[PDB]
Design a protein around this ligand. Structure first.
Ligand SMILES: NC[C@@H]1O[C@H](O[C@H]2[C@@H](O)[C@H](O[C@@H]3[C@@H](O)[C@H](N)C[C@H](N)[C@H]3O[C@H]3O[C@H](CO)[C@@H](O)[C@H](O)[C@H]3N)O[C@@H]2CO)[C@H](N)[C@@H](O)[C@@H]1O
Ligand SMILES: [Mg+2]
Ligand SMILES: [Mg+2]
Ligand SMILES: [Mg+2]
Ligand SMILES: [Mg+2]
Ligand SMILES: [Mg+2]
Ligand SMILES: [Mg+2]
Ligand SMILES: [Mg+2]
Ligand SMILES: [Mg+2]
Ligand SMILES: [Mg+2]
Ligand SMILES: [Mg+2]
Ligand SMILES: [Mg+2]
Ligand SMILES: [Mg+2]
Ligand SMILES: [Mg+2]
Ligand SMILES: [Mg+2]
Ligand SMILES: [Mg+2]
Ligand SMILES: [Mg+2]
Ligand SMILES: [Mg+2]
Ligand SMILES: [Mg+2]
Ligand SMILES: [Mg+2]
Ligand SMILES: [Mg+2]
Ligand SMILES: [Mg+2]
Ligand SMILES: [Mg+2]
Ligand SMILES: [Mg+2]
Ligand SMILES: [Mg+2]
Ligand SMILES: [Mg+2]
Ligand SMILES: [Mg+2]
Ligand SMILES: [Mg+2]
Ligand SMILES: [Mg+2]
Ligand SMILES: [Mg+2]
Ligand SMILES: [Mg+2]
Ligand SMILES: [Mg+2]
Ligand SMILES: [Mg+2]
Ligand SMILES: [Mg+2]
Ligand SMILES: [Mg+2]
Ligand SMILES: [Mg+2]
Ligand SMILES: [Mg+2]
Ligand SMILES: [Mg+2]
Ligand SMILES: [Mg+2]
Ligand SMILES: [Mg+2]
Ligand SMILES: [Mg+2]
Ligand SMILES: [Mg+2]
Ligand SMILES: [Mg+2]
Ligand SMILES: [Mg+2]
Ligand SMILES: [Mg+2]
Ligand SMILES: [Mg+2]
Ligand SMILES: [Mg+2]
Ligand SMILES: [Mg+2]
Ligand SMILES: [Mg+2]
Ligand SMILES: [Mg+2]
Ligand SMILES: [Mg+2]
Ligand SMILES: [Mg+2]
Ligand SMILES: [Mg+2]
Ligand SMILES: [Mg+2]
Ligand SMILES: [Mg+2]
Ligand SMILES: [Mg+2]
Ligand SMILES: [Mg+2]
Ligand SMILES: [Mg+2]
Ligand SMILES: [Mg+2]
Ligand SMILES: [Mg+2]
Ligand SMILES: [Mg+2]
Ligand SMILES: [Mg+2]
Ligand SMILES: [Mg+2]
Ligand SMILES: [Mg+2]
Ligand SMILES: [Mg+2]
Ligand SMILES: [Mg+2]
Ligand SMILES: [Mg+2]
Ligand SMILES: [Mg+2]
Ligand SMILES: [Mg+2]
Ligand SMILES: [Mg+2]
Ligand SMILES: [Mg+2]
Ligand SMILES: [Mg+2]
Ligand SMILES: [Mg+2]
Ligand SMILES: [Mg+2]
Ligand SMILES: [Mg+2]
Ligand SMILES: [Mg+2]
Ligand SMILES: [Mg+2]
Ligand SMILES: [Mg+2]
Ligand SMILES: [Mg+2]
Ligand SMILES: [Mg+2]
Ligand SMILES: [Mg+2]
Ligand SMILES: [Mg+2]
Ligand SMILES: [Mg+2]
Ligand SMILES: [Mg+2]
Ligand SMILES: [Mg+2]
Ligand SMILES: [Mg+2]
Ligand SMILES: [Mg+2]
Ligand SMILES: [Mg+2]
Ligand SMILES: [Mg+2]
Ligand SMILES: [Mg+2]
Ligand SMILES: [Mg+2]
Ligand SMILES: [Mg+2]
Ligand SMILES: [Mg+2]
Ligand SMILES: [Mg+2]
Ligand SMILES: [Mg+2]
Ligand SMILES: [Mg+2]
Ligand SMILES: [Mg+2]
Ligand SMILES: [Mg+2]
Ligand SMILES: [Mg+2]
Ligand SMILES: [Mg+2]
Ligand SMILES: [Mg+2]
Ligand SMILES: [Mg+2]
Ligand SMILES: [Mg+2]
Ligand SMILES: [Mg+2]
Ligand SMILES: [Mg+2]
Ligand SMILES: [Mg+2]
Ligand SMILES: [Mg+2]
Ligand SMILES: [Mg+2]
Ligand SMILES: [Mg+2]
Ligand SMILES: [Mg+2]
Ligand SMILES: [Mg+2]
Ligand SMILES: [Mg+2]
Ligand SMILES: [Mg+2]
Ligand SMILES: [Mg+2]
Ligand SMILES: [Mg+2]
Ligand SMILES: [Mg+2]
Ligand SMILES: [Mg+2]
Ligand SMILES: [Mg+2]
Ligand SMILES: [Mg+2]
Ligand SMILES: [Mg+2]
Ligand SMILES: [Mg+2]
Ligand SMILES: [Mg+2]
Ligand SMILES: [Mg+2]
Ligand SMILES: [Mg+2]
Ligand SMILES: [Mg+2]
Ligand SMILES: [Mg+2]
Ligand SMILES: [Mg+2]
Ligand SMILES: [Mg+2]
Ligand SMILES: [Mg+2]
Ligand SMILES: [Mg+2]
Ligand SMILES: [Mg+2]
Ligand SMILES: [Mg+2]
Ligand SMILES: [Mg+2]
Lengths: 272, 49
RNA sequence: GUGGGAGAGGGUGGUGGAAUUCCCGGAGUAGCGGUGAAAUGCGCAGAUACCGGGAGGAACGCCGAUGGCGAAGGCAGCCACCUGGUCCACCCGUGACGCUGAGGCGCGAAAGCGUGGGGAGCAAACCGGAUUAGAUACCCGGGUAGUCCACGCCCUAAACG
RNA sequence: CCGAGGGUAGGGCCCGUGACUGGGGCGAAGUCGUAACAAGGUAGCUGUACCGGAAGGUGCGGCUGGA
RNA sequence: CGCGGGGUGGAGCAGCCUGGUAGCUCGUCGGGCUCAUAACCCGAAGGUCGUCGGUUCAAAUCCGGCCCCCGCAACCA
RNA sequence: GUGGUUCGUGGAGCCAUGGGGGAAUCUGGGCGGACCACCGCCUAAGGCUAAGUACUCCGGGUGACCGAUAGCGCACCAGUA
RNA sequence: CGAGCUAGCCCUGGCCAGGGUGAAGCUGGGGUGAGACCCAGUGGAGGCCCGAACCGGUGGGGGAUGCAAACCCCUCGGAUG
RNA sequence: CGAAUGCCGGCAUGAGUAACGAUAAAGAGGGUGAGAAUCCCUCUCGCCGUAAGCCCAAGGGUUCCUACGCAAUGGUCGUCAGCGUAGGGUUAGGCGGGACCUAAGGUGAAGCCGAAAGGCGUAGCCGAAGGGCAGCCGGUUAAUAUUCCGGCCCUUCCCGCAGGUGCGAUGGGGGGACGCUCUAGGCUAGGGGGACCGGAGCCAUGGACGAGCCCGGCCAGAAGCGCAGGGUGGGAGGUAGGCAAAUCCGCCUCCCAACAAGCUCUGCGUGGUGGGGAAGCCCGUACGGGUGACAACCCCCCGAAGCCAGGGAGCCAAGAAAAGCCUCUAAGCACAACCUGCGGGAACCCGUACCGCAAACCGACACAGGUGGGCGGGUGCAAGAGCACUCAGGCGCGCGGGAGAACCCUCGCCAAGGAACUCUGCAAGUUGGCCCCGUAACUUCGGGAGAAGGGGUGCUCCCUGGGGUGAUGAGCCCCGGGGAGCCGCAGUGAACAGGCUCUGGCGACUGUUUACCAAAAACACAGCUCUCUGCGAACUCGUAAGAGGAGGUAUAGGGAGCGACGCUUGCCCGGUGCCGGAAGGUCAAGGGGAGGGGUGCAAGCCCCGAACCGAAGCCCCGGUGAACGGCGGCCGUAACUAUAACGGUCCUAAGGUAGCGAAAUUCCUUGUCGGGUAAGUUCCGACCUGCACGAAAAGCGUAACGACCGGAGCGCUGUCUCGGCGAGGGACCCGGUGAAAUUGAACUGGCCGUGAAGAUGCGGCCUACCCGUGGCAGGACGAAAAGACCCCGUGGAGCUUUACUGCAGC
RNA sequence: UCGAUGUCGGCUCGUCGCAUCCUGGGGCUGAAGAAGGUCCCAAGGGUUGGGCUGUUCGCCCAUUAAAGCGGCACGCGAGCU
């Protein structure tokens, strides 16, 4: 989708909005299973650690289910599909037959009315979740766990997905939304299908405000400030850095790798 | 234009208050000295009810 | 209308094997590439050649024809779904309902453009090496757009019988 | 009231003209190269695309007006 | 005015700093191939080293003065 | 690897120690300025211990100390206005 | 010792007269094989417009031992973000 | 002590000088008094009136009210006061806050961390104009009143009775509970009108005894009614979820409802009763009282932004928590308890005066400044909180009186010309609201547009079309149309209200910024690209714990640059960086000990110490430019000259492509052409010899946007030729109060000289009676700041880097 | 002169020198006349308005009897810009 606009105001011409057709007549969220008071704040205890944040629409947290072995075997019916301000993926709310309700990040396909479930059993269909081993090599899938019982963590962004590649001992090779081939443990669930609402990468914010709404204040270039507060700074009419591009704190930012070398997680990785 | 003193009872006891100064090691010393110097008033005289 | 036939006709989903390129393991050395001849290039930091495994893209050998299908552009591994055209027999139905067709509208190879994806091979531009008087060329070693996918454009041709 | 015309303001079409600029035509015997016609010494032509003093080259698909 | 770099056969350039030996490419000239020109092949010629001085046994070379050439600098007022 | 001592890496002991290694109970151990021999001196890895010493919020005494711009900031309801 | 000024952010409240312009979307008609689309009418969008409050502070003049250690007069920017 | 721009103090000079704090404005009569422009009173005048009037909150803290007072405070005066002395004055179960709840954030048992101090920290606790919660209208005081009094109406507790039910928690669930914009229906606040009702009165000056003028025609109010409107399905089975249990909630599955029919729940009317009730006139105030009065207290119309409220619709940026409340059960308990009515009793603490857009708050001041919320009438102007006037109400700004100079400020007008002004149309003018005609290039189809340029606008009469409220009508109120006619110079007749256009530069745009000299072309900005990061992420803060990132997960997060959009962004990887290289070379501690030394009679003890094994880094091999960067010189050549498509050569890592170009870049330079002008160092269009453009420190464009910057024209004008007159506030004179920086002392002239080189002071000459007042600024190298430039000091700071040396960090 | 002598130009206001631009007087002329040339005397008065540039200065445009050169802290900011 992606709503468009006629130019009746510069900016609201290039501006592009999402299409909330996929939003089952829902909107008002569900008390109980979410929401919780969401403590918004751009800095830690005192100081500001991440810069340029703050401001932007008030938000309510939708406490989603990111570990599904909670209900192994208990099937549930997908009730609605709603908007979640805390993420890029739309989320689906679903009523188990157990009578319990919980939200799930909604996969592309999954339609309201559908029945979905989790566990070793589970049929390989959009929405169902199973330990990685039991999933057919090659099938795509989202909401992966990295270590058994620790909760989902990979491919959860709007319309992202990972594809299974092979098996190898108690591990199974994956291919993350980034292109890295990772070795994940067999016992990590991963609900099947891709995340959906993949038009998300196409929304043209539009104006200055639009960014402000999502809580992101203006970002000033180092080049603009002085030597006192950033490498690229001073002296006359602009300047060409004058040294290898660096961050406010001073480490190179055009090429310098960061992953800490001797990490134990190294051996389970294979790509880029 | 607007100036720098905008009186506020709450802020004043809340900041230069007595329990305020007792709470920290530096403030307790603030008291010591003032006590040791004589000062009729150890801390500002906030008021009302 | 009835009952049959052939076909790379069209769209969608899926799938198979050969080969190339890369990665990993093995084993193995002093050269491999390349050309008119060469050089650039690659190779003891272990290349080429050989075996094993894995990844990925694109194109479908034999069948294949001087064959088939389409209005053209064009269409080729295999499977299923949706779908167009068309030939024969039977002479059952309508009953002149026909032909062409300014304009309109649709389709329209390759290259090109937008947005996103993909990128193995190839390859404008570009970089080298030779050739030459010179080479902004032909030849050789690299190589990016593009070539592939989806959606939206562009409307050209020796779009030729 | 209408009304010749005059006034003011803004448009439409056409003609003339202009520093300088673009390509074209024409003009016996100036320069550079050799693209095409013989297999033209890289078959040629082509739509498109990028590049080059120049003819032109190269990519992609195409045509026989070549084999 | 100040600073430092450069003048070498017809053309463009080496050769000096560690003085004695001027080299490269093109061009020029004679011959060859060609029907002829070029390309190409074989042979040959060509430099008071910007000038006036001395330094040495010996100066393109080292050291002073002018002669043009090029490049830089000329700020704070 | 450092701190302490006069000792600033010096021939650098001694006394403390963060790190690593890691004993013995008198024929046991430490020290006398690297080290070794000899000759000697002490007996580490537990603790306490008056007095002699420092100070002056406070009381008292005395001044070749001041005498209201001095002397405490304040002789006076001053850490006040 | 200070964020009772100023800067940013967090939590919780409040304010923005009245005028313009008229987006999507609806509905009707037209169109087609179905569409695209085109007409009206409806609709009430927007860091849209005029303009107070309010937030500013463009130009000029005055003030310059001032009314004022940043003011006054005329003029002017924004004013649903 | 004579100097230190010395320190403390005192008193001079400037000087009766400047001032006396908004140009809203005063005049008189009568009081009081020792003394009145300044205090009280009355009359007249003027100013505010989306306030300069009322009501809260903050802050202040007696300023409140009253009596007696003027030394000081008051910019004058003062009999007055916000001043001095004294006395009085602030009354709550229902207002606000607390014996209620939670927010950010604090604090913090458990726990974690830190040399000490301390730092973190889920529970809990604290924390509020947010949630919850029971009082409305009058009357009284010199001063308090939702507090006292009257009327009417409520809330909790505790104890009884009376009757109902399994009652029962800090535990489960429900609810509370939530955005922005736009909105309907019905109400209310508030306002307009009345031939009706009620009122003292009044006919003036030519007319009017009139459906005349003037004034007023309400307020609260339980239950019950009515009218609006908000909430809500009712059964029954089954259950494995809501961290124990539930009959509750949730999820299934059958029924009857789909309606607000019914239950409740608010709001508004009406309501027993309770109150208020003008002008005017009489009074004595410093003000209130009396009468009007048995006051009347009725009918229309406009109507909210407020009420019903959790109403509705649309949109994306997706919009607190906890308690009260309802329900559910657990322990326990069911002679308890809880629910419902009825009584009786109990109901604490703190605030309460006054100021409150300001003389009581923040600005040293009775300071032209700053200060949050609510009410804010009428008429007219299209509307409105605009503007003009004016209700209620409040003021005339705590020095006056004269004068009628220069000059200044603010204002008004002007013959002829009109930008000649000037750096610049700076300033000022012109234009201006509404309605209707009519509007170009260009363009991202929105725009450009209020383009431009025009016409209309008052009042009177006639005819006539729509609504709204009332019944389908009168009225009352909104919108319209047509035709005659009247008057002035002029009809948005006053006030509020764009001058327009053409063409360049920069930046896309709305925004943002140097609080107090820069608002911009600077920053930001959507968007583009590069790079890091697989999640206990990178990064940041922190010694740590910890947190932010993020309750996010590659369509995500960090960093860098570029900066809408269009067309595009060439070549160089030699040097620097970063990226990739289980080979080499170097390389520290450590391992290793060939060999050597010191002492021992010796076993020994203690030292050095070569091979060799030894990381990262560097070296080295490769890559990489939307990484730091860089992107040539000299000669010759065409059949007129000229120029050079062509060639030679030298050196690079490669030798700037497209596009643009005398530029926000051009030194020479007012380059040379062309355009605008009578005339053009600027401006626009070209050429290219680009001192010294050039492609994400982006390149060249670009509609729209701009308090940005340049050039031009129209319109208009006191900018100007070139001034003139007029207004007011000062200036001046008089009475009252009365500063200042400055100051070696002064009895302080011109000239030509001279002097440390610029003399009132020295020489010579000239001039010159003593002292002021308004004026002008040439001078006293005039005042003001121990020059902000420059240099100096082995002075200081901020900043940089392949300066040195360290440290964090890796 | 740095315990401060405000600095270009413009404006306003002047004033002074003469090595005179004009007007007045004069000599020589290769002075027929008219108009010039050149020098001598002479400062009494006069010595324009515009375009461009911050400009001084210049170059223009239109005129004039002429469109003089200099000084006064590149005269004059307790006079202005
Ligand atoms: N008519 C020819 C048109 O112009 C071009 O041709 C033009 C040029 O290429 C051509 O130039 C030629 C040159 O090619 C050739 N190699 C040398 C010759 N001297 C030149 O000649 C030219 O100049 C000379 C003297 O002035 C004249 O007399 C002659 O007419 C003229 N053609 O002269 C032509 C104009 O006259 C295109 N090549 C051709 O395809 C096109 O159709
Ligand atoms: Mg909640
Ligand atoms: Mg912190
Ligand atoms: Mg803290
Ligand atoms: Mg930025
Ligand atoms: Mg800066
Ligand atoms: Mg720095
Ligand atoms: Mg820099
Ligand atoms: Mg610069
Ligand atoms: Mg038949
Ligand atoms: Mg046909
Ligand atoms: Mg096509
Ligand atoms: Mg194609
Ligand atoms: Mg994009
Ligand atoms: Mg290839
Ligand atoms: Mg050849
Ligand atoms: Mg090739
Ligand atoms: Mg054909
Ligand atoms: Mg023309
Ligand atoms: Mg040929
Ligand atoms: Mg050929
Ligand atoms: Mg050819
Ligand atoms: Mg081609
Ligand atoms: Mg090519
Ligand atoms: Mg030491
Ligand atoms: Mg000893
Ligand atoms: Mg010894
Ligand atoms: Mg001893
Ligand atoms: Mg012992
Ligand atoms: Mg002791
Ligand atoms: Mg004495
Ligand atoms: Mg004293
Ligand atoms: Mg005395
Ligand atoms: Mg003292
Ligand atoms: Mg519409
Ligand atoms: Mg609107
Ligand atoms: Mg706006
Ligand atoms: Mg506005
Ligand atoms: Mg002395
Ligand atoms: Mg004194
Ligand atoms: Mg005086
Ligand atoms: Mg005076
Ligand atoms: Mg005076
Ligand atoms: Mg006053
Ligand atoms: Mg008035
Ligand atoms: Mg008092
Ligand atoms: Mg009083
Ligand atoms: Mg009195
Ligand atoms: Mg007085
Ligand atoms: Mg005063
Ligand atoms: Mg008296
Ligand atoms: Mg008093
Ligand atoms: Mg409490
Ligand atoms: Mg109590
Ligand atoms: Mg807490
Ligand atoms: Mg704490
Ligand atoms: Mg609490
Ligand atoms: Mg509260
Ligand atoms: Mg209350
Ligand atoms: Mg009162
Ligand atoms: Mg119960
Ligand atoms: Mg409960
Ligand atoms: Mg609850
Ligand atoms: Mg009469
Ligand atoms: Mg009532
Ligand atoms: Mg349970
Ligand atoms: Mg009365
Ligand atoms: Mg609602
Ligand atoms: Mg609680
Ligand atoms: Mg009170
Ligand atoms: Mg009160
Ligand atoms: Mg107020
Ligand atoms: Mg006053
Ligand atoms: Mg005031
Ligand atoms: Mg205000
Ligand atoms: Mg009102
Ligand atoms: Mg109006
Ligand atoms: Mg007003
Ligand atoms: Mg005039
Ligand atoms: Mg006139
Ligand atoms: Mg005119
Ligand atoms: Mg002018
Ligand atoms: Mg002038
Ligand atoms: Mg201008
Ligand atoms: Mg102006
Ligand atoms: Mg412009
Ligand atoms: Mg302009
Ligand atoms: Mg801008
Ligand atoms: Mg500001
Ligand atoms: Mg400023
Ligand atoms: Mg601005
Ligand atoms: Mg400013
Ligand atoms: Mg964390
Ligand atoms: Mg988080
Ligand atoms: Mg990023
Ligand atoms: Mg920039
Ligand atoms: Mg910029
Ligand atoms: Mg580039
Ligand atoms: Mg490079
Ligand atoms: Mg390299
Ligand atoms: Mg490199
Ligand atoms: Mg490396
Ligand atoms: Mg190494
Ligand atoms: Mg140029
Ligand atoms: Mg330049
Ligand atoms: Mg001209
Ligand atoms: Mg002009
Ligand atoms: Mg010109
Ligand atoms: Mg540039
Ligand atoms: Mg760049
Ligand atoms: Mg730019
Ligand atoms: Mg702006
Ligand atoms: Mg004037
Ligand atoms: Mg006057
Ligand atoms: Mg006087
Ligand atoms: Mg003198
Ligand atoms: Mg004397
Ligand atoms: Mg004298
Ligand atoms: Mg003077
Ligand atoms: Mg001075
Ligand atoms: Mg000094
Ligand atoms: Mg300087
Ligand atoms: Mg030194
Ligand atoms: Mg000086
Ligand atoms: Mg002095
Ligand atoms: Mg003379
Ligand atoms: Mg003469
Ligand atoms: Mg003069
Ligand atoms: Mg001078
Ligand atoms: Mg000058
Ligand atoms: Mg001067
Ligand atoms: Mg001045
Ligand atoms: Mg002076």
């Amino acid at each position: 989708a992606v709503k468009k606009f006629k130019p009746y105001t510069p900016s609201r011409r290039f501006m592009t909005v999402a299409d909330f057709s996929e939003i089952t007549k829902t909107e008002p969220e569900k008390s109980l299973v979410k929401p919780l008071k969401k403590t918004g704040g751009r800095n830690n205890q005192g100081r500001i650690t991440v810069r340029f944040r703050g401001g932007g629409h008030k938000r309510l947290y939708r406490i989603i289910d990111f570990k599904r072995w909670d209900k192994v075997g208990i099937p549930a019916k997908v009730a609605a599909i709603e908007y979640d301000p805390n993420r890029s993926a739309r989320i689906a709310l679903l009523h188990y037959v157990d009578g319990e309700k919980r939200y799930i990040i909604a996969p592309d396909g999954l339609q309201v009315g559908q029945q979905v479930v989790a566990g070793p059993d589970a049929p390989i269909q959009v929405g169902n979740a199973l330990p990685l081993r039991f999933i057919p090599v090659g099938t795509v899938v989202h909401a992966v766990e990295l270590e058994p019982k620790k909760g989902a963590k990979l491919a959860r962004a709007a319309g992202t997905s990972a594809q299974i590649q092979g098996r190898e001992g108690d591990y199974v090779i994956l291919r993350l939304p980034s292109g890295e081939l990772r070795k994940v443990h067999g016992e990590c669930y991963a609900t099947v299908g891709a995340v959906g609402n993949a038009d998300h990468k196409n929304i043209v914010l539009g104006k200055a405000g639009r960014s402000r709404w999502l809580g992101r204040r203006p970002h000033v270039r180092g080049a603009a400030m002085n030597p006192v507060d950033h490498p690229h700074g001073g002296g006359e009419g602009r300047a060409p850095r004058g040294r290898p591009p660096a961050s406010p704190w001073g480490w190179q930012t055009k090429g310098l790798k960061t992953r800490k070398r001797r990490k134990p997680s190294s051996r389970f990785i294979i790509a880029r | 234009m607007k100036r720098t003193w905008q009186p506020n009872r709450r802020k004043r006891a809340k900041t230069h208050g007595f329990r305020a100064r007792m709470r920290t090691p530096g403030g307790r010393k603030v008291l010591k000295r003032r006590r040791q110097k004589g000062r009729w008033r150890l801390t500002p005289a906030v008021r009302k009810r």
